[PDB]
Design a protein around this ligand. Structure first.
Ligand SMILES: *P(=O)(O)OCC(C)(C)[C@@H](O)C(=O)NCCC(=O)NCCSC(=O)CCCCCCCCC
Ligand SMILES: [Mg+2]
Lengths: 69, 87, 79, 126, 221, 103, 115
C-alpha cells in the first residue's frame, strides 16, 4: 500500500538517528512523540493518506523548511 | 488665511553648504517660493542647546577648515550609503 | 572479547525494554508470536540495542534479524 | 552571553518539561529560535517567565528594547518575544490542541493545514 | 537604439523652482549608483527583495505584476499585485527607499493600458502568478514586447465604471460583459473636444535633453 | 409569534422549530414538503424547502479576490415559509412546555 | 477601514467562523477611541447570534507604504482573554503585528504565511 515498507522503516530509523544526534531537545519527549505519531498514523488502509504522509516525512527528514535541534 | 503663523519644534536633518539649503523636518506654513523667517526654538525643553552652535554666526572667510558638501544627521542614511540592513 | 559478555549484554538490554513482557527471553524468542511485536517494535528493539552496543548495524540486515541469537552472532562475527 | 544555550540552561533549573526548540530559517521571516515549553501549572509558567525575563534584563544588552510578558491573563498559554528568540509556555492540553511542532517543521505540509481547504469560492445555484 | 527615461525623472507641471528638481535628481542618481533600478513597464513581472526592519533585518522577497507606477522623484512608487493562497495582495514599493535590497524583472512586457487597476475586478487568473517562476531571457537591442491580452471581467458591479471614456481602457472584453445599450449609455460621457484641446498638452522634449545630460554627466563623474 | 421574527432571526427560529419537531417525533414537515427523511441539518432542510418552492436570491460573498455576487437558495424565504406553515398549523399540534412540565 | 456594521471575512479554521449559509459576520463595536479599525485593532462581531471579540489582520483600505493591501477585509477570532479560537491561518498576514504592541504572538505562531 505505501511507497515501500522498507522505506517507512528507514524513515523511522533515520528519525531516531536525528533524535539521538540532537542536543538541545529531550530524548524522552522526542521518542514518545514520534512513536505516538506513527502508532496513530498506521492502519489507515486508504494508502493515499499514507503516501502523502510518506512525502511529508521525507520533507521533515530533509528539514529544508525547518530543523529542530 | 493669509496671516502669519509659526511652527515650533522643527529640527534640521540636513544642510547643503554649496546651495545654502536647510532640510527642516515636517511642513512649514506658506506656499512654495515664499519667504519664511527661521530662528532657534523657543521651547523651554530645548533651551541651552546652542553651546556647539556657531556664535554669533558662521564666518566661512575666517574659517580654518572647509565644510563638507552636505552636513547630515547621525540617523540620516546618506544616499551614497549602502542598503541598510536591520538587526 | 567475551562471548558470554555479548550474550548477557543482549539479554540485559532486551530485559531493559518496558512494553514487551519478559516472559520467555531465550535466544529463539520469536518476537512476532511470543511477544506480538510488529516491524516498528522490532526496529525499536534494534535501536535499543544499538544505542549502547553497536554503531555498525545496517537496516538491510537488521530487518531480518528476528532473534537475539542472530543479534549475538552478528555482533560476534562483525567484531 | 544571552543565547539559546542560556535559555535552555535557565529552563533546566526552571524544570521545563518537554523543551522543544526549532531553528527557523531566514525564509520564514519570523525569528531564529522558536521554543515550546510545557510546565506543570499556571504558577509554574508565570515563575519560569519571570525568571527568564529577569535574567535577560540583568545579564546584558542595555541597548536593545525591553520584552513584555505576553498572555498574563491567559492561564493556559503564555508567550515572550525577545529580539530573535520566541518562547511559548503552555500546558500539555493546550499543546495537544495547538500542536506547533509539526506546524513549524512542515510549512503547509501540516495535518490541520491539509484538513483545511486552501481556498474555496461558492458558485451559483442550479 | 532605444533609450528609456524613468517616469519619475519627468516632474509634474507646476511653478516649482527647478533647483529643487535638480537636487532631487542628484539624490536619485546617487541612490541609483548604489542600487540598480531596472527598466520595466506596467504589466511587467517584478520580484523585489527588501529587508524587514522588525523581523531582525531578515531578507524578504515579493513577486507581482506591476499595475501602477505613480509618484515623482524620491517619492516614486510602483504597485505589485499577486494572488497568494487564493487571496489577492498588493504592495506599493518605493524605488528609492534604502530598504529595497534589489529589484529583478522576471518578465518584461507592456500592456494595452497605462494602468492595470481593473485587474482587481477582473478574473483572478489574470493576476495570479507563480512566486518561483524562472525569469525569462530578454534579447538585447530588442523592442519591448507588448502584450495584447484582453482579460475577462467579473459581473458588475465593479470598483469603478471602467467602460466610461475618461478611463480610456482597451484591455477589457466589454462585448462579453456589457450590452450594447449599456455601451451607448456610457458613451454619453465622451468628451471629443478634450483630445483636441491643445493647450493642456505638456512638452517634455525640451526637458528630457537636460535630464539625460545631467544623468550622463553624473555617470561620467 | 408574540414577538417580531426579524428581531431574532428566521434561521435560529427555524432551527429551534426543527429541533422541537424532532423531539416530539411527529415529522409532519417531511411529508408536507416531500422531503426524503427526517433530518436535523437546518441548512440542508432549508435548501430542500427552497428547492421545493423555487426561491433563489443573489447575495454577496467574501472571497480572497473581492466581493462576488452569487445566486443561492433563498434561505430566509424558506425559513419564513416554514414558520408560517407551522403557525398556521399544517405541521401538527405541538407542546413547547413538555420538558418543563415533565420536570 | 473596519467599523460598526461592516462585513468581515474570518480567516482562521474556527468552527464558529465556519458559516454553512455563506453569511458573513459584521462588526458591532470597535475597541478604539475613534471607532476606525486598522491592522491589529480589536473589534466585536455579532456572529451566529454570538458576540465574539476578534482581531483584524488585514483590511482592504490602503495603508502606509511597503505595507500589503488585501482585496478582502480579514479578521481572526479571539477569546475574551487572548487565546485564539481557531488553530491555524491559511491566508498570509502582515508581519507588522510584531512591531505593533499587543497580544499577537499566539496568532503569529499559528499563522502559516507572511507577506
Ligand atoms: P510493520 O511492517 O508491521 O508496519 C506496517 C504498518 C505500519 C502496520 C502499515 O501497514 C500501516 O498501517 N501504515 C503504513 C504507513 C502509514 O500508515 N503512515 C505513514 C507514516 S509517515 C510519518 O510518520 C510522517 C512523519 C512526520 C514527522 C512528525 C513528527 C513530529 C516531531 C516533532
Ligand atoms: Mg470603491
Amino acid at each position: 500500500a505505501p511507497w515501500s515498507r522498507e522505506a517507512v522503516l528507514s524513515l523511522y530509523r533515520a528519525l531516531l538517528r536525528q533524535g539521538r544526534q540532537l542536543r538541545y531537545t529531550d530524548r524522552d519527549f522526542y521518542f514518545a512523540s514520534i512513536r505516538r505519531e506513527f502508532r496513530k498514523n498506521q492502519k489507515l488502509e486508504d494508502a493515499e493518506a499514507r503516501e502523502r504522509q510518506l512525502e511529508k516525512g521525507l520533507v521533515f527528514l530533509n528539514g529544508k523548511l525547518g530543523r529542530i535541534i | 488665511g493669509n496671516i502669519y503663523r509659526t511652527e515650533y519644534g522643527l529640527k534640521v536633518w540636513r544642510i547643503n553648504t554649496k546651495h545654502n539649503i536647510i532640510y527642516v523636518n515636517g511642513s512649514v506654513p506658506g506656499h512654495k517660493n515664499c519667504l519664511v523667517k527661521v530662528k532657534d526654538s523657543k521651547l523651554p525643553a530645548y533651551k541651552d542647546l546652542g553651546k556647539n552652535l556657531p556664535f554669533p554666526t558662521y564666518f566661512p572667510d575666517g574659517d580654518e577648515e572647509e565644510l563638507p558638501e552636505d552636513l547630515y544627521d547621525e540617523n540620516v542614511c546618506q544616499p551614497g550609503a549602502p542598503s541598510i540592513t536591520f538587526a | 572479547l567475551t562471548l558470554e559478555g555479548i550474550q548477557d549484554r543482549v539479554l540485559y538490554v532486551l530485559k531493559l525494554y518496558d512494553k514487551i513482557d519478559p516472559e520467555k527471553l531465550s535466544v529463539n524468542s520469536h518476537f512476532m508470536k511470543d511477544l506480538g511485536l510488529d516491524s516498528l517494535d522490532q526496529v525499536e528493539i534494534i535501536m535499543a540495542m544499538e544505542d549502547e552496543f553497536g554503531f555498525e548495524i545496517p537496516d538491510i540486515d537488521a530487518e531480518k534479524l528476528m532473534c537475539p541469537q542472530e543479534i549475538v552472532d552478528y555482533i560476534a562475527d562483525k567484531k | 552571553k544571552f543565547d539559546i544555550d542560556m535559555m535552555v540552561s535557565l529552563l533546566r533549573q526552571e524544570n521545563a518539561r518537554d523543551i522543544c526548540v526549532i531553528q527557523v530559517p531566514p525564509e520564514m521571516r519570523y525569528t531564529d529560535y522558536f521554543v515550546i515549553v510545557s510546565g506543570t501549572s499556571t504558577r509554574h509558567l508565570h515563575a519560569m517567565a519571570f525568571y527568564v525575563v529577569k535574567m535577560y534584563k540583568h545579564l546584558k544588552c542595555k541597548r536593545d528594547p525591553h520584552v513584555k510578558i505576553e498572555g498574563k491573563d491567559t492561564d493556559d498559554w503564555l508567550c515572550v518575544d525577545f529580539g530573535s528568540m520566541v518562547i511559548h509556555l503552555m500546558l500539555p492540553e493546550t499543546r495537544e490542541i495547538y500542536e506547533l511542532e509539526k506546524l513549524w517543521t512542515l510549512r503547509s505540509y501540516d495535518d490541520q493545514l491539509a484538513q483545511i481547504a486552501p481556498e474555496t469560492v461558492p458558485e451559483d445555484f442550479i | 537604439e532605444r533609450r528609456f527615461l524613468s517616469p519619475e525623472f519627468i516632474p509634474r507641471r507646476g511653478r516649482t523652482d527647478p533647483l529643487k528638481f535638480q537636487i532631487e535628481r542628484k539624490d536619485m542618481l546617487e541612490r541609483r549608483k548604489v542600487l540598480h533600478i531596472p527598466e520595466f513597464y506596467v504589466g511587467s513581472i517584478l520580484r523585489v527583495t527588501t529587508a524587514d526592519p522588525y523581523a531582525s533585518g531578515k531578507i524578504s522577497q515579493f513577486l507581482g505584476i506591476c499595475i501602477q507606477r505613480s509618484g515623482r522623484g524620491l517619492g516614486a512608487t510602483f504597485i505589485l499585485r499577486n494572488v497568494i493562497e487564493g487571496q489577492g495582495v498588493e504592495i506599493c514599493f518605493e524605488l528609492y527607499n534604502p530598504r529595497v535590497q534589489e529589484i529583478q524583472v522576471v518578465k518584461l512586457e507592456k500592456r494595452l493600458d497605462d494602468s492595470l487597476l481593473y485587474l482587481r475586478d477582473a478574473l483572478p487568473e489574470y493576476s495570479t502568478f507563480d512566486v518561483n517562476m524562472k525569469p525569462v531571457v530578454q534579447e538585447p537591442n530588442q523592442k519591448v514586447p507588448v502584450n495584447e491580452l484582453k482579460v475577462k471581467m467579473k459581473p458588475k458591479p465593479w470598483s469603478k465604471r471602467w467602460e466610461r471614456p475618461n478611463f480610456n481602457i482597451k484591455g477589457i472584453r466589454f462585448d462579453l460583459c456589457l450590452t450594447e445599450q449599456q455601451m451607448k449609455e456610457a458613451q454619453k460621457w465622451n468628451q471629443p473636444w478634450l483630445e483636441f484641446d491643445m493647450m493642456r498638452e505638456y512638452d517634455t522634449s525640451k526637458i528630457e535633453a537636460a535630464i539625460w545630460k545631467e544623468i550622463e554627466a553624473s555617470k561620467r563623474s | 409569534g408574540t414577538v417580531l421574527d426579524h428581531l431574532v432571526g428566521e434561521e435560529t427560529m427555524a432551527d429551534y422549530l426543527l429541533y422541537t419537531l424532532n423531539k416530539h417525533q411527529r415529522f409532519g414537515y417531511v411529508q408536507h414538503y416531500g422531503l426524503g427523511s427526517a433530518c436535523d441539518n437546518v441548512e440542508r432542510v432549508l435548501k430542500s424547502v427552497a428547492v421545493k418552492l423555487g426561491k433563489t436570491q443573489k447575495v454577496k460573498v467574501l472571497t480572497g479576490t473581492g466581493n462576488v455576487n452569487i445566486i443561492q437558495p433563498n434561505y430566509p424565504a424558506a425559513a419564513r415559509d416554514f414558520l408560517q406553515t407551522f403557525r398556521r398549523g399544517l405541521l401538527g399540534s405541538v407542546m413547547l412546555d413538555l420538558d418543563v412540565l415533565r420536570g | 477601514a473596519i467599523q460598526k456594521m461592516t462585513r468581515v471575512r474570518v480567516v482562521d479554521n474556527s468552527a464558529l467562523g465556519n458559516s454553512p449559509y455563506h453569511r458573513a459576520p459584521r462588526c458591532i463595536h470597535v475597541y478604539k477611541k475613534n471607532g476606525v479599525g486598522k491592522v491589529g485593532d480589536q473589534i466585536l462581531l455579532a456572529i451566529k447570534g454570538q458576540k465574539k471579540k476578534a482581531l483584524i489582520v488585514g483590511h482592504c483600505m490602503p495603508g502606509p507604504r511597503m505595507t500589503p493591501r488585501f482585496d478582502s477585509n480579514n479578521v481572526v477570532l479571539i477569546e475574551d482573554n487572548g487565546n485564539p479560537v481557531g488553530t491555524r491561518i491559511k491566508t498570509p498576514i502582515p508581519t507588522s503585528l510584531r512591531k505593533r504592541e499587543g497580544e499577537y504572538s499566539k496568532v503569529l505562531a499559528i499563522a502559516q504565511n507572511f507577506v
